[PDB]
Design a binder for this molecule. Sequence first.
Ligand code: HEM
Ligand code: HEM
Ligand SMILES: Cc1cc(N)nc(CCc2cncc(CCN(C)C)c2)c1
Ligand SMILES: Cc1cc(N)nc(CCc2cncc(CCN(C)C)c2)c1
Ligand SMILES: C[C@H](O)[C@H](O)[C@H]1CNc2nc(N)[nH]c(=O)c2N1
Ligand SMILES: C[C@H](O)[C@H](O)[C@H]1CNc2nc(N)[nH]c(=O)c2N1
Ligand SMILES: [Cl-]
Ligand SMILES: [Cl-]
Lengths: 362, 362
Amino acid sequence: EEKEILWNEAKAFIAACYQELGKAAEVKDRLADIKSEIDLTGSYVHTKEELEHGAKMAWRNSNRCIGRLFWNSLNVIDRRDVRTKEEVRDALFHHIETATNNGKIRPTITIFPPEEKGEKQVEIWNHQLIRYAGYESDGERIGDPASCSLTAACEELGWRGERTDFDLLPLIFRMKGDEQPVWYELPRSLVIEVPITHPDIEAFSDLELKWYGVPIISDMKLEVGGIHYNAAPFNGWYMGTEIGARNLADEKRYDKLKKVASVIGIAADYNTDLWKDQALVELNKAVLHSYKKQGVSIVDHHTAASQFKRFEEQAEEAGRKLTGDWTWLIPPISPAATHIFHRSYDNSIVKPNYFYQDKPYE
Amino acid sequence: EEKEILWNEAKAFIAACYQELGKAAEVKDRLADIKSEIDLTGSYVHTKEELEHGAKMAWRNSNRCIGRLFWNSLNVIDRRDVRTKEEVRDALFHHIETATNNGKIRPTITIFPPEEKGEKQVEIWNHQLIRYAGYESDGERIGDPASCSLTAACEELGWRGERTDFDLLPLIFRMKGDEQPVWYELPRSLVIEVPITHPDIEAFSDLELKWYGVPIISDMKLEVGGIHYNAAPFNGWYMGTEIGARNLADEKRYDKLKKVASVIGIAADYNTDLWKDQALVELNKAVLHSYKKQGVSIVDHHTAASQFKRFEEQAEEAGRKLTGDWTWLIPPISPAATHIFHRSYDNSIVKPNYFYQDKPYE
Ligand code: HEM
Ligand code: HEM
Ligand SMILES: Cc1cc(N)nc(CCc2cncc(CCN(C)C)c2)c1
Ligand SMILES: Cc1cc(N)nc(CCc2cncc(CCN(C)C)c2)c1
Ligand SMILES: C[C@H](O)[C@H](O)[C@H]1CNc2nc(N)[nH]c(=O)c2N1
Ligand SMILES: C[C@H](O)[C@H](O)[C@H]1CNc2nc(N)[nH]c(=O)c2N1
Ligand SMILES: [Cl-]
Ligand SMILES: [Cl-]
């Protein structure tokens, strides 16, 4: 039953992967070995080339990602060899360091051993490798509300946050065979953060806003040819709106628009004044300015959309169907100023791809 | 075949309409009369009450409309009695006058005789009753590009535009039996226009922008209980973004963002400066300010979304399913600052409703 599904996924993947790599003549033999490996073992093992191209295809197929033009330059780190929590920890520290690259961010994925019988070898609890803690208790909100449930799980395991608005959560993951996950404080030297200032408005620094340099999603599953890599953290560089229009702006996140309005010297009393819109534009300008001043890679939503248009053009040129989720591709500010807003996209799921999975906390 | 479809639509509509009106006991008899009327005539005729409530239901069911909270206060004008082009013209002039209401806009629909054998009695060519002409010839763009095809059709019929950027198109419609439509110049006294100025930036008036007061969609079909009212123009008041973020901003419309950037004194050289976003916010502030100064009804997108939230709440309270098109309901600026962005909607089509129809030009 499962080896039927596996074998079928393998045939589809290997065929497509080898076509793209100019190695179609090797398919039959490779497929032969896989058939035997599955029969004899219940699974199969990707070559380094297959794993690398698979991760790249999965990014290429990610409907919700505007940044896909650069899919083929993804840096794939093969860590299927890790067996200990120390090795996992050091691999995660290494990912942070190499992806950060002193600010010139390298899109990277680190791939850990895949599920066996659907049994995870390693299970990463963090949503992103770098993220801020959040607390809520008796009227008091501190930090990132989105992190409240994971923060509480961490404090159940003996970690204690300082309760600033920007506590770095520890790395937290569980090894096969262990009942509880382990946690490790992030070395501050590894984590680039960017204080938010505004190019023109000197008072903006009074808000004492900052954000971290590199978004590293660590809780999605990479599926490649029937093999389930549930632990495979990946990163790009930020699009500014992610920070300025969502992380710092949403009422259910840092909720800073009223405070932004005050420091930029506009009233926040009347909807018709469009003060939220003005505050959003200034906050987003500040975010882009700040990352660039500090030499940390970032892209604005106009440039990103222009790049995505090139991705569309390349898909058609290569004779590949384009898939996308319009609702996620449009930027959260000035969406109609982008070409994305004015066309539609097929939201079909194509594999290899990255998928959500259930949180082991909650 | 057709009388089957008609009768079935009639049963569903009359049943629902009379439930809502507290007249469920009258359904059986009314349904009896309709059954006979269809058999004997091939069609049936709505009571004034049915027609009025039907138009209101159609608005309530319009998935792409954020303004639906006020569905039950729609002003329905029954003009099923018109037979001549003079009467149609005067009914259209009347709609403009009564809906405008000296600036305190009244949501209104005027309903003309419905299709018979699918044969239209009157066919309105205008997309909106008030709209600006557009011209393109040998490098030269003037006016509203969206109106180019209708403008060209009008000039085929002996009309000539002055070729300003804001020529009012004439009313243009065709009567049953006539090969060509007729056209009538709009009396300027009927048409309120609003010059666009900015509350703070005096130079904004140098752009010489203006827009008309009342959006009156005149080319959609109202379907009520199997009866097809192909000529039934309707209006609300504007949401500011329609004018400021789309009509005046789109590259394929008036394309004013670069000129806005210049008058507000910011550079339009770098994507990372978010100059388009800033220009959009200032243009949208100017639009709202200008309509309010002139005493013409308008709503900003924040207030409109708050009203739409109340519409959602009322639907659930009344035990009615809510339908909506997320892609049209989100405003084109700061969409994530509205609740709409953060939930989903069922885009199912429910009747009565308003529908697109093929343009007789093009
Ligand atoms: C190189 C720079 C990149 C940029 C600028 C970029 C941009 C974005 C943005 C703006 C989002 C929406 C995030 C949100 O609203 O939560 C997104 C989602 C996504 N990106 Fe990218 N991305 C990049 C690289 C990558 C890479 C390297 C991968 C994988 C190898 C990836 C896979 C995805 C996936 C799977 C999502 C959806 C995540 C979810 O559903 O929560 N992206 N991207
Ligand atoms: C009272 C004030 C109203 C406001 C503020 C409002 C708001 C809006 C907005 C912003 C749109 C999107 C238009 C576009 O992007 O092209 C829209 C679409 C629509 N509205 Fe409303 N509306 C109002 C009244 C009405 C009325 C009275 C009706 C009908 C009786 C109506 C039916 C519709 C329909 C059918 C659409 C979709 C049109 C299309 O597909 O092009 N609305 N509305
Ligand atoms: C790889 C990558 C690049 C990039 N520019 N951005 C992200 C995602 C940032 C991000 C990751 N995960 C969750 C949220 C908020 C998620 N909500 C929907 C739960 C944001 C990922
Ligand atoms: C009734 C009503 C109220 C309101 N506030 N707005 C509109 C629509 C304005 C409008 C009407 N028709 C076409 C466009 C642009 C349409 N493109 C998609 C073709 C805009 C209609
Ligand atoms: C292709 C895409 O659906 C298209 O740009 C839509 C998006 N949402 C919209 N929403 C509104 N209100 N009006 C529009 O014209 C559009 N255009
Ligand atoms: C319900 C709705 O789909 C939801 O708000 C989505 C909309 N589009 C989005 N787009 C991005 N990029 N990120 C998000 O978190 C969301 N949220
Ligand atoms: Cl993020
Ligand atoms: Cl309009």
